[PDB]
Design a protein around this ligand. Structure first.
Ligand SMILES: C[As](C)(=O)[O-]
Ligand SMILES: [Rb+]
Length: 431
């Protein structure tokens, strides 16, 4: 429960000490893909790909249940009531349950239309509906992982999260071959290997673990808000792609290359965000607002610094790096122009994003959603359209327009995160 350093400590040591394990954890996630495509090396069952979005749906939902958990529990632990804490574990678990059920039943009955609105059947569909159904079979397990994630994240115990990450990655590494060789299962077998690995995680979490519509409303609101933020971001990508492709198909190919790196650069900011959730939650609940504001700014310091270094390397790397990924030159050239133009807006994502965490931690999710909309919708769209169609810049206007929003939400976060009567009264009301 304790997490030494939380209340009286240095915030930099505290933030990093929680943020590194979580980052090792996020690193293990990759080995799934790597080991998988490694053993899949030993166009019919390729329709596994067609169902890959539904997984990304589920994880997001799972993520909601995590933050809702993490946010609530960490404040209850800060108020030293492990009373609301156990209550919270029970409610969160029940939410996880109802989500699992409504999702699997609705998913089942609407199966065929959903599957239609994804990929075409001229070859692959039976495969598609088969794997769709397996995907459905993983759902309560995923929700459970979420629950646990936010459980240990809430109480600040992140070594448990990392250690479970490692155990999972290992298990998958080992079972992949056994499934393909001992059991002759194939692609199906690498999926199953991956799922058993996740269940190994849930196992480890539970074993470790051994040793009132107001609260439903609170948990629901934070969780749903989290989900709605995921959904907003998804939309942001969608709009962007729309503009890019309708202008230049190469620009699309370019983005298709840069994306995995652009995300990777972000991820350390993500782990910082996860640590900041716990810290702000637990100090908030302890009634010290001044430290929560400091925690936010300490985080923005770390996150900005790191992401900035990485974006700069991405810039210096890109002209040499991208020409090796494709033989179409305006595709690699687009990729390079994109990176040159947009890369430095990246550290500035920390200001807005991290602020969306603060408001989640203190259970005021409206301003989280607001900041996300600021970043991805309200400014970018009219400005992109102004630069890229109206003024006659084309892909370049998209590059600039898109990042304008990032800066505006950065400014809004700067103005919001500070001692105010409203914030201080929020915390009184809370405690
Ligand atoms: C009315 As209020 C919760 O913004 O102080
Ligand atoms: Rb972006």
């Amino acid at each position: 429960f304790t997490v030494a350093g939380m209340f009286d400590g240095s915030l930099y040591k505290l933030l990093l000490r929680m943020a590194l394990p979580m980052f090792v954890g996020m690193l293990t996630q990759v080995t799934y893909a790597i080991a998988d495509i490694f053993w899949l090396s030993h166009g019919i069952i390729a329709g596994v790909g067609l169902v890959f979005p539904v997984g990304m749906g589920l994880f997001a939902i799972a993520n909601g249940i995590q933050i809702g958990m993490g946010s609530l529990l960490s404040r209850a632990i800060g108020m030293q009531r492990l009373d609301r804490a156990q209550r919270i574990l029970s409610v969160g678990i029940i939410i996880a349950l109802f989500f699992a059920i409504v999702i699997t039943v609705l998913g089942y009955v609407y199966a065929q239309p959903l599957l239609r609105s994804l990929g075409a059947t001229k070859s692959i569909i039976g495969y598609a509906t088969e794997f769709y159904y397996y995907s459905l079979l993983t759902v309560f397990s995923i929700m459970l992982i979420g629950v646990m994630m936010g459980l240990f994240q809430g109480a600040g115990k992140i070594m448990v999260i990392m250690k479970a990450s490692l155990l999972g990655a290992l298990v998958n590494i080992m079972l992949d071959p056994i499934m393909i060789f001992v059991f002759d299962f194939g692609v199906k077998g690498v999926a199953l290997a991956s799922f058993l690995a996740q269940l190994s995680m849930v196992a480890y979490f539970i074993y470790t673990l051994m040793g009132s519509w107001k609260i439903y409303r609170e948990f629901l609101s934070v969780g749903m808000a989290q989900m709605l933020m995921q959904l907003i971001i998804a939309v942001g990508i969608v709009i962007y792609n729309f503009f890019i492709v309708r202008l230049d198909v190469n620009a699309m190919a370019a983005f298709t290359l840069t994306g995995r790196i652009d995300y990777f650069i972000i991820t350390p900011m993500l782990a910082i965000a996860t640590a900041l959730l716990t810290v702000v939650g637990q100090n908030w609940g302890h009634g010290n607002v001044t430290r929560t504001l400091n925690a936010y700014w300490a985080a923005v310091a770390l996150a900005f610094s790191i992401v900035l270094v990485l974006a700069v390397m991405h810039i210096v790397l890109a002209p040499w790096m991208y020409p090796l990924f494709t033989r179409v030159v305006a595709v690699s050239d687009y990729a390079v122009l994109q990176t040159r133009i947009m890369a430095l807006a990246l550290p500035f994502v920390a200001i807005s994003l991290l602020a969306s965490e603060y408001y989640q931690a203190i259970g005021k999710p409206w301003y989280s959603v607001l900041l996300t909309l600021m970043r991805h919708v309200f400014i970018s769209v009219p400005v992109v359209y102004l630069l890229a169609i109206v003024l006659e810049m084309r892909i370049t206007g998209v590059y600039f327009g898109a990042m304008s929003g990032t800066f505006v939400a950065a400014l809004l976060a700067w103005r919001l995160l500070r001692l105010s009567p409203r914030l201080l009264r929020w915390n009184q009301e809370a405690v």
